[PDB]
C-alpha cells in the first residue's frame, strides 16, 4: 500500500 505508487 504505497500511497505514491503509480496507477494500475
Amino acid at each position, epitope marked *: 500500500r*504505497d500511497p*505514491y505508487s*503509480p*496507477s494500475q
Partner: antibody
Amino acid sequence: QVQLVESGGGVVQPGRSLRLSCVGSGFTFRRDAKYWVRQAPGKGLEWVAAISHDGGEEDYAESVKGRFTISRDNSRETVYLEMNSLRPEDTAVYYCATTRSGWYFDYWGQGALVTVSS
Amino acid sequence: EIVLTQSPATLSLSPGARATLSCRASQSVDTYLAWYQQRRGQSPRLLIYDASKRATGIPARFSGSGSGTDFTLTISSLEPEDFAVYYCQQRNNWRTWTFGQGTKVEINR
C-alpha cells in the same frame, strides 16, 4: 519524449502568494505522482511537495507545510504549487518532477525562479 | 527520520580519471537510493536508482553500488561534461524525500 515545463515564476513580496504551474507532455500524466523540488541560490536540492496520481494523497516538507498546497489537473496534464505566506528564504528555483514508481525523481522540468523580497 | 550525507565536498580530478563519490545514510535504507547529476546552469537528472540501476539513456561509465548505510557512485572515466555536482536521494516512511548535501567534481590542476 518526457517533458515538463514550469511557468509562473517571478518576484513577490513577503506575506503574499504565488502559484506555479507545470505542464507535462510525451507521457501519461495521470499515471504517476508529481513533485516539486527547489534549490535556493548556491544551495542544494530540497524536496518541497508530493501528490499522488489521482490527488488523493499530498505531503510536504516541514519547511513549507501549512503554507504550500500542491494540486493537479490530469485532464490538463498540469500540476500546481500554490505558495502562501511566502518568506525570503523561500527564494529558490522550483523544479517540477515526475516519477516511475514514487521513490525517485525520474524526470525534471526546467525550473521556475521565485524571488521573495520587499 | 533519515539523514543523507555525502563525501567529499569537492572531488578534484583530471579528465579521464576514475571518480568515486560516497553517500551515507544515518540508518539503513536497503538499496532504495538514487543519484543525480546537476551540471552548471542545468536541471538535475537521474543517473542511478535502486542503488545500482542505470536510468534510461545514462552512459555505461556511471555505476552505483552499496547497500544499508554506505553507497558509492563510480564514474569509470570522467568526461568534460561530468564535472558537475552530484546528489544522492532517499525516501523514508512513504511521505518524505531527502537529499544529501551534494559533491562537486572539479578539474584538478
